[PDB]
């Protein structure tokens, strides 16, 4: 079932086809297509572990030892040591439902094992892959329809936030930082909607910081509506904390002037050489006085500077700033309202942004400073300041924070949702059974195994938080069919009851339309190949 | 090479440009046209100046090439086009006309 | 001789054929003791380009001016054979009087 | 002059599409925005441009 | 054999001669058509092949498959490059001509076999395939009325067919009619770099859309961008070549001074410099500014300052397309900066698509160019669609330049098999023989396409044989249907040119492979 083909010629002389055919396999025909099944089944039986509130965390280590707990599904994929071309489809799948909705990135690993596990079935029963690809297709078209039919609309206005709140609490609920839960679930929410533009525009995500740092608790992470700088003060003796400042932002060193191009200065003469030392100590002195005219009270530099400098602008009660970088110039620039200024000759007081606390923190016993830039008049720019009690949950935090923030962005693009944990799966399950029964009998298999892959979500959620799968999936769906309910889910929590718009698990409708898509096309490229051609060469 | 300056002001007085790599082509384009390789960028003279019914860009097959047309049936230097199925049909084939 | 004029201008056949035999390099030549040329403009580079062909020139007008002062007809010929180098510049100045020429020779 | 006949070959439509062309055909492009002229005349430098 | 003392070639040379090397080359033949087999119409499937590297491919196009294999048999590289040749003429039917290659050389292996002298098996092949690209040429569907609606209806069939094999056979309507717009544009060249085809991970097939104008990718914008506005109104574009930093006015530029009043002179003259060309640029009226070489910081916060938008590092084709939608000119100096080299588009914006940042040029009435934003869940997918949507635009490239069609699914080609038989039951007989042959041969398009959609391919083609002989010239596969029906009708056109190619390469490698008798394979040095 290998090597390709191998005849050595009717005449007995040497046939030789393609370059090391010898070392070479290959598949073919049904068994490919099983081979491509069980990979993806394994990998989605992998991943389906980690659905839900009582969902269960996957310890990753990479290369070089390091460890990252996560329930990232994304995030678990990509640090995978994959070899299976399947399962590389499936990391891209997860990465690419990470692009564009930021979340269910676990829940379309799921969904696509259990439509190629439905595959799998009918092919053994004898129907031909691209038939149970179009079947998949008009059965996920349907649902996608069914969403859009059953969908809600919220509000996305900032007077009233408590939807929002409540997806971001949804979102966030699966992860670790569930014990700050609605704390974590306010601050995503307000930093998406400081920096966003109102017409329903874009979010840019460049313009949030999230920096996190050890020590502390879990519960100090907090929403800072300004700046947080890695650096600290240049000079030791300059005051900590500078209050109404007007920070005045610069990208010159405070040096003297070097032009770009190879240029070479003359000294022919001891008057040079007091002409050049006195020109020296005056652009010191001119630069300085440049700064100090505007009436700044900070001054900000991207690339440095010297000790005459520094003793200066200590000297003239002009606390400073250098080295920042690019990003962190450009963040400053946008919270304080201020200009990025290229030289001292073009500085003016109108530049000058304005800050309402500028202040240096210490973090324990551990010598680490950093600045905070707050109180701005009216920052576009935000930061997420995270603590805890080991890098690990920092890191999760950073990622469960980050989907937070996918999916109010999401929200302010379509305001649309549709009630989650199982619910919106069991009734889009139930529209594709119905629409079974008018189509014609040879796609209606494709359509009855498109909606039991529906239905391995509530089946995943249900056995996650211990209880009977197939019982309670069956219940749910028997109350929702007997009364026009499509918000019936699992109740993963034990709350007590199964409606999901009572216990406010909200679901971008964005998010479950993309998921259907994606898993039915992967599902469909799957499905379509038929031949692998590996080099076999078991390379070092 | 074309310089950056030479080819944006040559755009604006509209004027076409062709590189030819090799010398030996710019020879045999000297001869079919009837122009002087010219050292300098001086302005070519009357006798210098080289002659063409057509010269425009096409497309053969998946090709990009330019051509230098004579409407007359006659110059100095006439080619051959070959078309084909295989390169090494082609070159049987240049042999053949060899 | 082994080779022929490098000029594609150039004649093939003379009937009538003065020789000069020279061992007089006419291709450019770099200064021993390393030059290297300062300009302010583009003007400037122009006129230093201009200028820094003037020596070979001077031999090449040299040669010019001996076939014009030999024979003020077209009937006869100049074959130049030179046990050096000689650069296109001064090939096409050559060409252009009708004189064929010949470089590195045994 | 047997060098005064060039050959070009272009793959793709069998040897019966072959044609014979009064000129030079250059597989390559067009540097400049100008990519057809009617009344051509061409200046030809030995010198980059 | 006798060891002669000096032996003629070097040790090592490898000679076949005879029949049993022509037989082993038309079975390499066969061996590379099998692995493009299945690959065939609508009920097609895909090859993922794997390189040394482990970077796997996914396709379904047969040149594209062909080259990925490391074919070395000097008779089967005959196929591949007979595919890569369709491709590049035509670009749709790789799969057809290898298929009929060796659909050709399998009919007359049992001819090769008992001695039949190889001139004669070439004049039947040149002589059928003549009278084949006649019958095309003279049976191919034209309709002369010049009306702009039918053919746009036509352009579009083709296109649908042409991509009713593809993983985007679902969307193929509109894929098709998004192919159709975009060739439309295109102004008298229908050069292929025209039309752009940018590739975006994640998102369904059907969020694809199709610019009027020009997009590209975000290209590392330095500090102080974000201050820029990102959405305008009615901007003029100063497509640019034009480095806008501060540097050494040339690589060779010395500068000596003897003066610190000199020195500080130098200074402000650079920023002068540089200034200069900021405010030449802002004093053109324009509002957004792109080049193909670096801005600097200092000109990206100079244009913030202004409520400018800049974009450095803008690649060759983007700007070339950019010039092309909006009607601009590319300047490598600002010094004449007038109205007429100054784009023009009704909206520009900068937006967020799948996880990256994309500039939009919309809006363009007078654009010549188009690009495509393709969403998909893999690189693969994104790959796999981008090549079956250059195989409908070359399809719609050809229809566009003549607009000859004929019914698929093999009606033509069964059509074909009936007129070569006729011809052939009317000659002495030693041609007849191999003409039959061909004729046979030709049937090999509509079996494999009933063998890939699970069919009995006996029984359809019996009842397409005796349909095509009573009558219908456009009779077909129907592949959903389970059966024959008119192709014509049922919109699978493709253009004639494709046919009568794919017929011509397929002739023309038949022809090659059998005119050789000996293979001689010297040492690898
Ligand atoms: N409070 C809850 N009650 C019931 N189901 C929930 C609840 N919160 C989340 N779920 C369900 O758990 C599933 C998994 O969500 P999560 O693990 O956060 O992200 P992903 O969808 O990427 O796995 C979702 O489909 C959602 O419907
Ligand atoms: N809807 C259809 N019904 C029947 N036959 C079709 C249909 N669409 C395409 N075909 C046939 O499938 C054959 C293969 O086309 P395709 O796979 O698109 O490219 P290639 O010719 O390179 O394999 C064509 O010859 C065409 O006649
Ligand atoms: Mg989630
Ligand atoms: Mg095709």
Not at chain 3, 53 to 58: N, P
Not at chain 5, 42 to 69: C, E, H, Q, Y
Not at chain 5, 92 to 106: H, R, Y
């Given at each position: 079932?290998?090597?390709?083909?191998?005849?050595?010629?009717?005449?007995?002389?040497?046939?030789?086809?393609?370059?090391?055919?010898?070392?070479?396999?290959?598949?073919?025909?049904?068994?490919?297509?099983?081979?491509?099944?069980?990979?993806?089944?394994?990998?989605?039986?992998?991943?389906?572990?980690?659905?839900?509130?009582?969902?269960?965390?996957?310890?990753?280590?990479?290369?070089?030892?390091?460890?990252?707990?996560?329930?990232?599904?994304?995030?678990?994929?990509?640090?995978?040591?994959?070899?299976?071309?399947?399962?590389?489809?499936?990391?891209?799948?997860?990465?690419?439902?990470?692009?564009?909705?930021?979340?269910?990135?676990?829940?379309?690993?799921?969904?696509?094992?259990?439509?190629?596990?439905?595959?799998?079935?009918?092919?053994?029963?004898?129907?031909?892959?691209?038939?149970?690809?179009?079947?998949?297709?008009?059965?996920?078209?349907?649902?996608?329809?069914?969403?859009?039919?059953?969908?809600?609309?919220?509000?996305?206005?900032?007077?009233?936030?408590?939807?929002?709140?409540?997806?971001?609490?949804?979102?966030?609920?699966?992860?670790?930082?569930?014990?700050?839960?609605?704390?974590?679930?306010?601050?995503?929410?307000?930093?998406?909607?400081?920096?966003?533009?109102?017409?329903?525009?874009?979010?840019?995500?460049e313009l949030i910081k999230?920096e996190?740092?050890?020590?502390?608790?879990?519960?100090?992470?907090?929403?800072?509506?300004?700046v947080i700088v890695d650096?600290?003060?240049?000079?030791?003796?300059?005051?900590?904390?500078?209050?109404?400042?007007?920070?005045?932002?610069?990208?010159?060193?405070?040096?003297?002037?070097?032009?770009?191009?190879?240029?070479?200065?003359?000294?022919?003469?001891?008057?040079?050489?007091?002409?050049?030392?006195?020109?020296?100590?005056?652009?010191?002195?001119?630069?300085?006085?440049?700064?100090?005219?505007?009436?700044?009270?900070?001054?900000?530099?991207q690339?440095?500077?010297?000790?005459?400098?520094?003793?200066?602008?200590?000297?003239?009660?002009?606390?400073?700033?250098?080295?920042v970088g690019g990003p962190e110039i450009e963040l400053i620039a946008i919270?304080?309202?201020?200009?990025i200024?290229?030289?001292?000759?073009?500085?003016?007081?109108?530049?000058?942004?304005?800050?309402?606390?500028?202040?240096?923190?210490?973090?324990?016993?551990?010598?680490?400073?950093?600045?905070?830039?707050?109180?701005?008049?009216?920052?576009?720019a935000?930061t997420?300041?995270?603590?805890?009690?080991?890098?690990?949950?920092?890191?999760?935090?950073?990622?469960?924070?980050?989907?937070?923030?996918?999916?109010?962005?999401?929200?302010?693009?379509?305001?649309?949702?549709?009630?989650?944990?199982?619910?919106?799966?069991?009734?889009?399950?139930?529209?594709?059974?119905?629409?079974?029964?008018?189509?014609?009998?040879?796609?209606?298999?494709?359509?009855?195994?498109?909606?039991?892959?529906?239905?391995?979500?509530?089946?995943?959620?249900?056995?996650?938080?211990?209880?009977?799968?197939?019982?309670?999936?069956?219940?749910?769906?028997?109350?929702?069919?007997?009364?026009?309910?499509?918000?019936?889910?699992?109740?993963?929590?034990?709350?007590?009851?199964?409606?999901?718009?009572?216990?406010?698990?909200?679901?971008?409708?964005?998010?479950?339309?993309?998921?259907?898509?994606?898993?039915?096309?992967?599902?469909?490229?799957?499905?379509?190949?038929?031949?692998?051609?590996?080099?076999?060469?078991?390379?070092? | 090479?074309?310089?950056?300056?030479?080819?944006?002001?040559?755009?604006?007085?509209?004027?076409?440009?062709?590189?030819?790599?090799?010398?030996?082509?710019?020879?045999?384009?000297?001869?079919?046209?009837?122009?002087?390789?010219?050292?300098?960028?001086?302005?070519?003279?009357?006798?210098?100046?080289?002659?063409?019914?057509?010269?425009?860009?096409?497309?053969?097959?998946?090709?990009?090439?330019?051509?230098?047309?004579?409407?007359?049936?006659?110059?100095?230097?006439?080619?051959?086009?070959?078309?084909?199925?295989?390169?090494?049909?082609?070159?049987?084939?240049?042999?053949?006309?060899? | 001789?082994?080779?022929?004029?490098?000029?594609?201008?150039?004649?093939?056949?003379?009937?009538?054929?003065?020789?000069?035999?020279?061992?007089?390099?006419?291709?450019?030549?770099?200064?021993?003791?390393?030059?290297?040329?300062?300009?302010?403009?583009?003007?400037?580079?122009?006129?230093?380009?201009?200028?820094?062909?003037?020596?070979?020139?001077?031999?090449?007008?040299?040669?010019?001016?001996?076939?014009?002062?030999?024979?003020?007809?077209?009937?006869?010929?100049?074959?130049?054979?030179?046990?050096?180098?000689?650069?296109?510049?001064?090939?096409?100045?050559?060409?252009?009087?009708?004189?064929?020429?010949?470089?590195?020779?045994? | 002059?047997?060098?005064?006949?060039?050959?070009?070959?272009?793959?793709?439509?069998?040897?019966?599409?072959?044609?014979?062309?009064?000129?030079?055909?250059?597989?390559?492009?067009?540097?400049?925005?100008?990519?057809?002229?009617?009344?051509?005349?061409?200046?030809?430098?030995?010198?980059?441009? | 054999?006798?060891?002669?003392?000096?032996?003629?070639?070097?040790?090592?040379?490898?000679?076949?001669?005879?029949?049993?090397?022509?037989?082993?080359?038309?079975?390499?033949?066969?061996?590379?058509?099998?692995?493009?087999?299945?690959?065939?119409?609508?009920?097609?499937?895909?090859?993922?092949?794997?390189?040394?590297?482990?970077?796997?491919?996914?396709?379904?196009?047969?040149?594209?498959?062909?080259?990925?294999?490391?074919?070395?048999?000097?008779?089967?590289?005959?196929?591949?490059?007979?595919?890569?040749?369709?491709?590049?003429?035509?670009?749709?039917?790789?799969?057809?001509?290898?298929?009929?290659?060796?659909?050709?050389?399998?009919?007359?292996?049992?001819?090769?076999?008992?001695?039949?002298?190889?001139?004669?098996?070439?004049?039947?092949?040149?002589?059928?395939?003549?009278?084949?690209?006649?019958?095309?040429?003279?049976?191919?569907?034209?309709?002369?009325?010049?009306?702009?609606?039918?053919?746009?209806?036509?352009?579009?069939?083709?296109?649908?067919?042409?991509?009713?094999?593809?993983?985007?056979?679902?969307?193929?309507?509109?894929?098709?009619?998004?192919?159709?717009?975009?060739?439309?544009?295109?102004?008298?060249?229908?050069?292929?770099?025209?039309?752009?085809?940018?590739?975006?991970?994640?998102?369904?097939?059907?969020?694809?859309?199709?610019?009027?104008?020009?997009?590209?990718?975000?290209?590392?914008s330095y500090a102080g961008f974000e201050?820029?506005?990102?959405?305008?109104?009615?901007?003029?574009?100063?497509?640019?070549?034009?480095?806008?930093?501060?540097?050494?006015?040339?690589?060779?530029?010395?500068?000596?001074?003897?003066?610190?009043?000199?020195?500080?002179?130098?200074?402000?003259?650079?920023?002068?410099?540089?200034?200069?060309?900021?405010?030449?640029?802002?004093?053109?009226?324009?509002?957004?500014?792109?080049?193909?070489?670096?801005?600097?910081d200092?000109?990206?916060?100079?244009?913030?300052?202004?409520?400018?938008?800049?974009?450095?590092?803008?690649?060759?084709?983007?700007?070339?397309?950019?010039?092309?939608?909006?009607?601009?000119?590319?300047?490598?100096?600002?010094?004449?900066?007038?109205?007429?080299?100054?784009?023009?588009?009704?909206?520009?914006?900068?937006?967020?698509?799948?996880?990256?940042?994309?500039?939009?040029?919309?809006?363009?009435?007078?654009?010549?160019?188009?690009?495509?934003?393709?969403?998909?869940?893999?690189?693969?997918?994104?790959?796999?669609?981008?090549?079956?949507?250059?195989?409908?635009?070359?399809?719609?490239?050809?229809?566009?330049?003549?607009?000859?069609?004929?019914?698929?699914?093999?009606?033509?080609?069964?059509?074909?098999?009936?007129?070569?038989?006729?011809?052939?039951?009317?000659?002495?007989?030693?041609?007849?023989?191999?003409?039959?042959?061909?004729?046979?041969?030709?049937?090999?398009?509509?079996?494999?396409?009933?063998?890939?959609?699970?069919?009995?391919?006996?029984?359809?083609?019996?009842?397409?044989?005796?349909?095509?002989?009573?009558?219908?010239?456009?009779?077909?596969?129907?592949?959903?249907?389970?059966?024959?029906?008119?192709?014509?009708?049922?919109?699978?056109?493709?253009?004639?040119?494709?046919?009568?190619?794919?017929?011509?390469?397929?002739?023309?490698?038949?022809?090659?492979?059998?005119?050789?008798?000996?293979?001689?394979?010297?040492?690898?040095?």
């Amino acid at each position: 079932a290998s090597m390709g083909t191998l005849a050595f010629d009717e005449y007995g002389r040497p046939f030789l086809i393609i370059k090391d055919q010898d070392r070479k396999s290959r598949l073919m025909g049904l068994e490919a297509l099983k081979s491509h099944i069980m990979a993806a089944k394994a990998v989605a039986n992998t991943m389906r572990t980690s659905l839900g509130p009582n969902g269960l965390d996957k310890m990753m280590v990479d290369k070089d030892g390091d460890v990252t707990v996560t329930n990232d599904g994304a995030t678990i994929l990509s640090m995978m040591d994959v070899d299976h071309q399947i399962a590389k489809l499936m990391v891209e799948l997860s990465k690419s439902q990470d692009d564009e909705i930021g979340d269910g990135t676990t829940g379309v690993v799921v969904l696509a094992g259990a439509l190629l596990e439905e595959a799998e079935q009918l092919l053994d029963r004898g129907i031909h892959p691209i038939r149970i690809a179009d079947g998949y297709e008009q059965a996920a078209r349907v649902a996608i329809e069914h969403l859009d039919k059953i969908s809600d609309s919220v509000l996305v206005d900032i007077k009233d936030t408590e939807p929002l709140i409540q997806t971001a609490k949804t979102t966030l609920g699966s992860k670790v930082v569930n014990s700050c839960h609605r704390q974590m679930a306010e601050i995503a929410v307000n930093a998406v909607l400081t920096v966003a533009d109102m017409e329903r525009r874009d979010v840019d995500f460049e313009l949030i910081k999230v920096e996190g740092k050890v020590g502390g608790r879990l519960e100090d992470t907090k929403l800072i509506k300004g700046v947080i700088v890695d650096k600290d003060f240049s000079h030791p003796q300059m005051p900590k904390k500078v209050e109404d400042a007007k920070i005045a932002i610069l990208t010159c060193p405070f040096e003297p002037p070097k032009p770009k191009t190879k240029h070479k200065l003359d000294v022919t003469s001891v008057e040079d050489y007091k002409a050049l030392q006195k020109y020296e100590k005056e652009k010191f002195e001119e630069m300085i006085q440049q700064i100090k005219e505007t009436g700044a009270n900070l001054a900000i530099c991207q690339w440095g500077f010297d000790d005459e400098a520094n003793h200066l602008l200590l000297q003239n009660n002009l606390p400073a700033v250098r080295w920042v970088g690019g990003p962190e110039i450009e963040l400053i620039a946008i919270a304080t309202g201020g200009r990025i200024v290229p030289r001292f000759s073009e500085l003016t007081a109108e530049k000058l942004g304005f800050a309402g606390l500028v202040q240096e923190i210490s973090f324990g016993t551990t010598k680490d400073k950093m600045l905070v830039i707050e109180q701005c008049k009216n920052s576009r720019a935000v930061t997420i300041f995270i603590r805890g009690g080991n890098k690990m949950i920092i890191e999760e935090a950073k990622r469960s924070l980050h989907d937070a923030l996918c999916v109010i962005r999401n929200l302010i693009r379509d305001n649309r949702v549709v009630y989650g944990g199982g619910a919106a799966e069991i009734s889009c399950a139930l529209a594709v059974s119905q629409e079974a029964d008018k189509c014609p009998t040879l796609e209606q298999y494709a359509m009855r195994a498109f909606a039991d892959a529906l239905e391995v979500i509530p089946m995943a959620l249900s056995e996650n938080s211990g209880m009977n799968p197939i019982q309670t999936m069956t219940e749910v769906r028997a109350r929702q069919v007997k009364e026009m309910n499509p918000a019936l889910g699992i109740d993963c929590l034990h709350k007590g009851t199964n409606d999901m718009k009572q216990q406010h698990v909200i679901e971008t409708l964005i998010g479950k339309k993309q998921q259907i898509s994606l898993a039915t096309q992967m599902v469909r490229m799957i499905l379509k190949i038929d031949d692998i051609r590996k080099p076999g060469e078991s390379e070092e | 090479k074309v310089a950056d300056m030479a080819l944006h002001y040559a755009n604006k007085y509209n004027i076409m440009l062709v590189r030819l790599n090799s010398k030996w082509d710019l020879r045999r384009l000297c001869k079919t046209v009837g122009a002087t390789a010219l050292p300098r960028l001086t302005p070519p003279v009357l006798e210098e100046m080289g002659h063409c019914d057509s010269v425009y860009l096409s497309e053969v097959g998946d090709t990009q090439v330019v051509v230098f047309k004579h409407e007359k049936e006659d110059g100095a230097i006439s080619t051959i086009v070959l078309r084909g199925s295989t390169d090494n049909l082609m070159d049987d084939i240049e042999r053949a006309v060899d | 001789l082994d080779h022929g004029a490098r000029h594609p201008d150039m004649k093939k056949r003379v009937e009538d054929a003065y020789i000069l035999t020279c061992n007089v390099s006419l291709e450019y030549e770099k200064t021993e003791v390393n030059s290297g040329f300062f300009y302010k403009s583009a003007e400037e580079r122009e006129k230093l380009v201009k200028a820094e062909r003037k020596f070979i020139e001077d031999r090449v007008k040299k040669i010019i001016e001996l076939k014009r002062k030999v024979c003020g007809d077209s009937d006869k010929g100049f074959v130049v054979i030179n046990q050096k180098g000689i650069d296109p510049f001064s090939l096409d100045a050559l060409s252009k009087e009708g004189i064929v020429a010949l470089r590195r020779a045994k | 002059n047997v060098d005064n006949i060039r050959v070009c070959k272009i793959l793709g439509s069998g040897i019966s599409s072959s044609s014979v062309l009064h000129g030079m055909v250059f597989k390559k492009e067009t540097e400049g925005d100008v990519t057809s002229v009617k009344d051509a005349k061409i200046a030809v430098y030995s010198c980059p441009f | 054999m006798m060891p002669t003392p000096v032996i003629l070639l070097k040790e090592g040379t490898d000679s076949s001669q005879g029949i049993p090397q022509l037989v082993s080359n038309i079975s390499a033949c066969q061996v590379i058509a099998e692995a493009v087999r299945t690959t065939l119409g609508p009920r097609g499937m895909d090859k993922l092949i794997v390189d040394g590297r482990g970077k796997a491919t996914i396709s379904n196009d047969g040149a594209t498959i062909l080259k990925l294999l490391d074919v070395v048999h000097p008779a089967a590289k005959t196929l591949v490059d007979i595919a890569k040749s369709q491709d590049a003429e035509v670009g749709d039917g790789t799969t057809s001509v290898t298929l009929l290659a060796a659909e050709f050389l399998k009919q007359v292996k049992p001819y090769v076999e008992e001695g039949l002298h190889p001139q004669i098996i070439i004049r039947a092949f040149r002589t059928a395939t003549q009278l084949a690209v006649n019958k095309i040429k003279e049976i191919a569907v034209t309709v002369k009325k010049a009306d702009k609606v039918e053919q746009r209806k036509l352009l579009e069939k083709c296109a649908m067919t042409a991509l009713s094999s593809k993983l985007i056979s679902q969307q193929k309507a509109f894929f098709a009619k998004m192919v159709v717009d975009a060739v439309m544009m295109l102004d008298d060249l229908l050069q292929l770099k025209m039309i752009g085809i940018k590739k975006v991970q994640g998102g369904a097939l059907e969020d694809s859309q199709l610019v009027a104008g020009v997009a590209f990718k975000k290209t590392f914008s330095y500090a102080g961008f974000e201050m820029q506005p990102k959405k305008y109104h009615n901007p003029k574009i100063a497509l640019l070549n034009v480095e806008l930093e501060l540097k050494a006015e040339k690589d060779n530029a010395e500068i000596r001074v003897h003066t610190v009043e000199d020195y500080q002179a130098i200074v402000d003259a650079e920023w002068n410099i540089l200034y200069d060309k900021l405010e030449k640029i802002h004093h053109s009226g324009a509002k957004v500014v792109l080049s193909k070489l670096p801005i600097g910081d200092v000109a990206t916060q100079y244009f913030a300052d202004r409520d400018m938008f800049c974009a450095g590092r803008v690649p060759e084709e983007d700007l070339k397309r950019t010039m092309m939608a909006c009607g601009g000119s590319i300047q490598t100096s600002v010094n004449a900066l007038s109205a007429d080299v100054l784009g023009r588009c009704q909206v520009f914006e900068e937006t967020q698509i799948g996880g990256e940042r994309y500039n939009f040029f919309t809006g363009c009435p007078k654009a010549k160019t188009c690009t495509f934003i393709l969403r998909g869940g893999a690189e693969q997918f994104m790959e796999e669609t981008e090549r079956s949507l250059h195989d409908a635009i070359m399809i719609v490239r050809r229809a566009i330049k003549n607009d000859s069609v004929v019914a698929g699914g093999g009606a033509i080609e069964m059509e074909l098999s009936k007129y070569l038989r006729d011809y052939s039951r009317t000659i002495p007989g030693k041609q007849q023989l191999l003409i039959g042959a061909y004729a046979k041969a030709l049937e090999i398009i509509p079996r494999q396409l009933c063998d890939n959609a699970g069919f009995d391919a006996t029984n359809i083609l019996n009842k397409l044989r005796a349909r095509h002989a009573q009558g219908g010239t456009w009779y077909g596969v129907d592949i959903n249907n389970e059966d024959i029906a008119d192709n014509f009708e049922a919109f699978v056109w493709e253009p004639a040119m494709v046919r009568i190619n794919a017929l011509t390469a397929a002739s023309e490698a038949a022809c090659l492979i059998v005119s050789v008798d000996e293979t001689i394979k010297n040492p690898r040095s």
